[PDB]
Design a protein around this nucleic acid. Structure first.
Ligand SMILES: [Zn+2]
Length: 1028
DNA sequence: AAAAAAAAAAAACCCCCCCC
DNA sequence: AAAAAAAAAA
DNA sequence: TTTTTTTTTTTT
RNA sequence: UUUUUUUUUUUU
């Protein structure tokens, strides 16, 4: 049984103080010149583990001190009673037993209420309790049955432990010593080398700010490594650990020796879903490293990541910042189209299936590759130290098995591991690209040979008979030195031939399996013919979504919870499918998706709140419903940003087949329109993007052909017969947009740099540029304030958050007219609300409470969610519109909520409570039903308590919507007390105790004043806060 | 000629919280 | 410019 | 009574 | 029960 630090122990004030004192004392006591900082760090970790154990034991003893004392007294009295019976001793025994039962019940209620508060704070939000609600129950890691090496089925713990340990030891023990072959392979193919500045940046001394940033960036609530220390320990005590972490990291920089804790890793085996649990090869292993080792590796990972752009070619998008996966996907699809359009088909797209690449990459080859790339000095020394003695131990069924060395393979669970693996695989990628005998596919002017995402490689080959054999030879040569072994039999490939005998010969000569219809790459079903891209990617997406909704048909959550479920599980899949294949989709797809989503959201019932209202912004109810058509439009138009930026690494944008206008996309956004050119006739992604961009620009009444962001090298200047040297000078000296040059009176007159640029340009180009820019039309079209759309697509040099910004802008643009239920409420109560009242009601809906159940109830009350007798009477085409519960009156929504004679007593009790709060709130239904207050009550010092009381009353009334009994004041007290308890424990957890007390003390006092002792006892109503 | 928006007509299912 | 959640891919 | 769907008209 | 990249949503 290993030791794991809990986050509850860290949050304790006394424990935190004692732990900080112990850390400071150890750092100022055991530091000397006879002990290295690595051994001192290991001793510090051990002492911290011991101190944490001692503090936890002390806390448990203190929490159980009363229980222990009462138990000892009870045992002594029982022994005395057995020795000699006495009535008074029996009375004492009974009293002690009653006190013990009361304390145990109080502790159980404490735990239950803490769990309930944690749940209710996230009841319907996009968070853990909802993700675990939709996800299938997690399979346990308790592996009791396995198939041994002799083919027998065994359940003996020793045999299964031995089998698993031996399998994972033999997996990581295949370390190669052929250094000469590694050197030969590295010298055979050219690799990039970092310059002096980048090497110095890598080898720069570590500073405190880097360690602080890495510690703050550590994800929370993550399983700790073998030492049991979580990231929360380092985040909470960073003010005391950062100096000693600096000392340790400088020591390891100078010496190249790491603490023994930096090597030990914990391997957890996950049973692969859909696979046999009795096979040793059907388990996914994951490695947990110590938090300090992860911090060091993350520092190194960031240091190498700041140069990974130069070290890694843009063909590899996995683990590379600023590179998205679909960069390859569309690219691959484009290649397929070019093959389908070729008159002579002699092509092959091979999906190379790497077999446990992370577990088979040779550490010596990785080190030699790092040395070859010019990475040397402190950084290389630290990396070599990391992989000098890596050791991992398997946690099987909660038991720590004997550790085995990681002789080969890259340490999983390491932040530096993905970048090192990319560096290693880049040698093979460049060898394939630099091999003249391995011919790629020529898409226009771009030769495409391979695309990469981590170890998932796709190779595009022309003339497969020779190209594929050369690729296999090169891959085998790379594997002989690096261990990057390929499961060829599992490498699905599309083979395009124009002759059956040629296809048969290629299949016979090559060991690659041939996929006739589809290949799964990055979760996308790439098709042999692009015309089936929909049929294999979006129709199966609809089928999967329908199956998921049918599985979630009886899920125990409300409509808000189901909307958040759609946003959490369904929305990312649809967004990813749109990003990978943004093709023109029929309205049938969107109609079916919307129908399925709406049926799931409303539990196969008719929508109580209009879809158009929820499709608006958060001001229209606070919940919002995902608009899939707007997300699709945003995804399609996103490519315009890459068009305008014109990155040299976005090769996918240059892979679109075309016969005319070879260079249009970089001259298409904020540029002169095409001169009646029928470009993109057979385009698959880009033409639809341009069409949607034009549609959005037309809807905005915007001119997208001459904007303030019109590039200097755009068609507007090139059509002036301006020499390319002048354009380059303008780009280098003034800026990138025509606004930087200036138009009208501002033409080359904004800066002395403009004077220099004018002096550096040929006079004819100056004359033509002045004629174009100083023209009235250009001046009025350029010198204008750009909108949010142009700013989104031009002013952002980074694509992070681009989809969200475009979607928000489209939702703002497509602000369809919707009915206002608050105005309907005003009509019901014979009142007129100003725009201030409407905004107040919307803000009350948005900010009703931290928990989502209270907000959902407030939204239901305000947005006319609840059904009324009038609605049912009209639906059933009958005159039985009399109000429910029996009053003989017409059952309007206002009457059922506020004006019912059987509901009036509850509101009168609420107003009596308000009077006891010294709040002269008028008996106005708008205040509780919509959150609309008169101008005389603009003070917010009492609005929180009033909101809690009103929402509790709304819950109580809704509970008895069609019951003949009146909404009971006791039920209202109980509901507001449940809210009080949940908010109390939430404020304790979230350190919001002061505001909670300020908003709940008077209400709690009024509650306790009007309740009898029996009611308080049987309803678990008792004081929870004091004078604090 | 095609797409988008607005208007009109038809249809539904007497509670509603609760439910990790 | 921070904190948290989830999902996608590997 | 409310929402969704279909049809018609208008604009590009 | 990891790590990296990217994405969305919510709270300022
Ligand atoms: Zn009534």
């Amino acid at each position: 049984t290993t030791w794991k630090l809990n986050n509850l122990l860290l949050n304790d004030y006394w424990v935190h103080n004692e732990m900080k004192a112990e850390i400071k004392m150890f750092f100022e006591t055991n530091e000397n010149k006879d002990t290295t900082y690595q051994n001192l760090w290991d001793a510090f970790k051990a002492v911290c583990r011991g101190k944490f154990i001692a503090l936890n034991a002390y806390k448990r003893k203190q929490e159980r001190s009363k229980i222990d004392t009462l138990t000892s007294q009870l045992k002594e009295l029982e022994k005395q009673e057995q020795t000699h019976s006495k009535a008074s001793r029996r009375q004492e025994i009974t009293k002690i037993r009653a006190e013990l039962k009361e304390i145990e019940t109080q502790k159980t209620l404490q735990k239950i209420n803490e769990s309930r508060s944690w749940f209710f704070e996230r009841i319907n939000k996009i968070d853990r309790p909802l993700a675990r609600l939709i996800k299938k129950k997690r399979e346990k890691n308790q592996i009791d049955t396995i198939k041994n090496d002799k083919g027998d089925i065994t359940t003996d713990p020793t045999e299964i432990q031995t089998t698993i340990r031996e399998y994972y030891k033999h997996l990581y023990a295949n370390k190669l010593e052929n250094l000469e072959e590694m050197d030969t392979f590295l010298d055979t193919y050219t690799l990039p080398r970092l310059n002096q500045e980048e090497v110095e940046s890598l080898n720069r001394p570590i500073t405190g700010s880097e360690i602080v940033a890495i510690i703050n960036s550590l994800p929370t609530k993550k399983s700790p490594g073998p030492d049991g220390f979580t990231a929360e320990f380092y985040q909470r005590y960073k003010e005391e650990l950062v100096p000693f972490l600096l000392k340790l990291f400088q020591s390891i920089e100078k010496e190249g020796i790491l603490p023994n804790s930096f090597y030990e890793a914990s391997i957890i085996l996950i049973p692969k879903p859909g696979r046999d649990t009795t096979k040793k090869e059907n388990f996914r292993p994951i490695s947990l490293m110590n938090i300090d080792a992860k911090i060091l590796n993350k520092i190194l990972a960031n240091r190498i990541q700041q140069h990974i752009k130069k070290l890694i070619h843009h063909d590899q998008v996995g683990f590379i910042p600023g590179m998205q996966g679909w960069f390859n996907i569309r690219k691959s699809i484009n290649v397929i189209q070019h093959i389908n359009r070729a008159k002579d088909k002699n092509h092959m797209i091979i999906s190379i299936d790497a077999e446990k690449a992370f577990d088979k990459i040779q550490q010596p080859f990785m080190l030699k590759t790092l040395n070859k790339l010019g990475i040397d000095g402190t950084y290389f020394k630290i990396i070599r130290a990391i992989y000098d003695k890596p050791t991992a131990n398997i946690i099987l069924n909660g038991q720590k098995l004997e550790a085995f060395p990681l002789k080969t393979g890259t340490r999983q669970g390491c932040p530096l591991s993905p970048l090192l693996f990319n560096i290693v695989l880049e040698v093979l990628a460049r060898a394939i690209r630099q091999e003249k005998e391995i011919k790629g596919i020529q898409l226009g002017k771009e030769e495409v040979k391979l695309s990469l995402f981590a170890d998932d490689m796709i190779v595009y080959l022309e003339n497969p008979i020779v190209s594929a054999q050369n690729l296999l030879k090169l891959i085998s040569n790379f594997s002989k030195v690096s261990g990057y072994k390929i499961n060829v039999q599992k490498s699905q490939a599309f083979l395009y031939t124009n002759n059956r005998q040629t296809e048969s010969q290629i299949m016979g000569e090559l060991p690659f399996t041939i996929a006739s219809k589809r290949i799964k790459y990055l979760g996308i079903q790439l098709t042999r013919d692009v015309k089936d891209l929909f049929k294999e990617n979006y129709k199966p997406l609809l089928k999967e979504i329908k199956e998921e909704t049918n599985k979630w048909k009886n899920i125990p959550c409300s409509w808000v919870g189901r909307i958040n479920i759609v946003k959490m599980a369904i929305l990312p899949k649809v967004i990813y499918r749109f990003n990978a294949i943004p093709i023109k989709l029929p309205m049938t797809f969107f109609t079916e998706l919307e129908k399925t989503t709406l049926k799931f959201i409303w539990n196969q019932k008719r929508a109580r709140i209009a879809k158009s209202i929820l499709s608006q912004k958060n001001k229209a109810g606070g919940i919002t419903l995902p608009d899939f058509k707007l997300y699709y439009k945003a995804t399609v138009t996103k490519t315009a940003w890459y068009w305008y930026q014109n990155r040299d690494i976005d090769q996918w944008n240059r892979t679109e087949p075309s016969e005319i206008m070879p260079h249009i996309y970089n001259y298409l956004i904020f540029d002169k329109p095409e001169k009646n050119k029928q470009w993109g006739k057979d385009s698959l992604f880009n033409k639809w993007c341009w069409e949607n961009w034009l549609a959005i620009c037309r809807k905005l009444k915007l001119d997208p052909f001459l904007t303030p962001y019109t590039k200097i090298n755009s068609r507007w200047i090139k059509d002036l017969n301006v020499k390319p040297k002048t354009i380059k000078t303008l780009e280098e000296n003034l800026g990138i947009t025509i606004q930087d040059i200036g138009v009208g009176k501002d033409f080359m007159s904004k800066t002395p740099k403009a004077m220099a640029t004018k002096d550096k340009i040929d006079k004819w180009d100056l004359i033509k540029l002045k004629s174009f820019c100083t023209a009235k039309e250009t001046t009025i079209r350029v010198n204008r304030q750009p909108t949010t759309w142009e700013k989104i697509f031009a002013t952002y040099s980074s694509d992070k958050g681009l989809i969200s910004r475009i979607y928000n802008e489209l939702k703002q643009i497509y602000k369809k007219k919707t009915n206002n239920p608050i105005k309907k409420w005003a009509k019901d109560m014979n009142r007129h609300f100003s725009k201030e009242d409407i905004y107040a009601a919307k803000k009350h809906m948005k900010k009703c409470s931290s928990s989502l159940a209270i907000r959902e109830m407030q939204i239901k009350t305000t947005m006319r969610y609840h059904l009324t007798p009038v609605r049912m009477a009209i639906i059933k085409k009958s005159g039985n519109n009399r109000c429910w519960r029996g009053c003989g009156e017409i059952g309007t929504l206002l009457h059922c909520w506020w004006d019912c004679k059987l509901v009036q007593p509850l509101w009168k009790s609420v107003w009596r409570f308000l009077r006891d709060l010294e709040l002269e709130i008028p008996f106005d239904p708008a205040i509780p039903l919509l959150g609309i207050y008169p101008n005389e009550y603009k003070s917010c010092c009492y609005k929180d308590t009033c909101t809690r009381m009103f929402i509790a009353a709304l819950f109580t009334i809704a509970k008895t919507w069609n019951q003949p009994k009146c909404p009971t004041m006791i039920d209202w007290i109980k509901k507001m007390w449940h809210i009080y308890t949940m908010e109390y424990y939430a404020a304790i957890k979230n350190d919001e105790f002061i505001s909670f007390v300020g908003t709940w003390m008077k209400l709690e006092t009024i509650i306790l004043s009007k309740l009898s002792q029996e009611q308080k006892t049987k309803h678990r109503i008792f004081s929870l806060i004091g004078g604090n």
